[PDB]
Amino acid sequence: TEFKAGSAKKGATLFKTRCLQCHTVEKGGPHKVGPNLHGIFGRHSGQAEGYSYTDANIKKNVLWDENNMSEFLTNPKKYIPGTKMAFGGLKKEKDRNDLITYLKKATE
Ligand code: HEC
């Protein structure tokens, strides 16, 4: 244990103001700058179809779990050096948690 549920709501506002600019969560939503993330958990890194991921992601070969996703979220360039995710990070444990709670939810 090292991940505890957050507010899906709050969850859904970080996404909007922090991840939508680049991504969609929804089954059938398109890839934009980043890929769509519907069904992200359970799946491995860089496998959405019709998406051109860096060498980095693919190689990283990550199992998208909640616990992973949080450290990634802490610092992505750090997690997967060579990723094209120009996303600095979410330094707060709390913020991450609501986010992941939202993700857990909306991409299922
Ligand atoms: C645009 C400037 C982005 C923002 C803001 C966020 N992400 Fe991102 N994401 C982006 C790219 C360009 C890529 C692929 C990079 C590469 O190495 O090819 C990604 C990848 C992800 C992944 C990996 C998914 C996979 O299928 O392997 C995840 C899980 C992801 N992005 C989620 C995500 C979230 C939750 C964000 C908000 C806090 C977010 N990203 C921001 C581009 C952009």
- 74: domain CATH number is 1.10.760.10
**Total domains in the fold of the chain:** 1
Number of H helices, E strands in the chain: 5, 0
Domain that holds residue 104: 1-108
**Residue whose CA is at the smallest distance from ligand 1 atom 28:** 37
Give 3-state DSSP helix, strand, coil % of the chain, rounded to 5: 40, 5, 55
How many Å lie between the centroid of ligand 1 and the Cα of residue 1? 25
Name, in order, each residue with C-beta under 8 angstroms of 15's C-beta and a sequence gap of 6 or more: 25, 99, 102, 103, 106
CA 102 – CA 43 distance, rounded (Å): 17
CA nearest to 26, candidates 40, 46, 43: 40
**Sign of the torsion formed by the C-alpha atoms of 74, 44, 102 and 16:** positive
Exposed / middle / buried, residue 9 (Cβ in 10 Å: 0-12, 13-18, 19+): exposed
The residues lining ligand 1, judged by C-beta closer than 6 Å to any ligand atom, are 18-19, 21-23, 33-35, 37, 40, 45-46, 48, 53-54, 56-57, 83-87, 90, 99
Q: Are 7 and 103 in contact (CB under 8 A)?
A: no
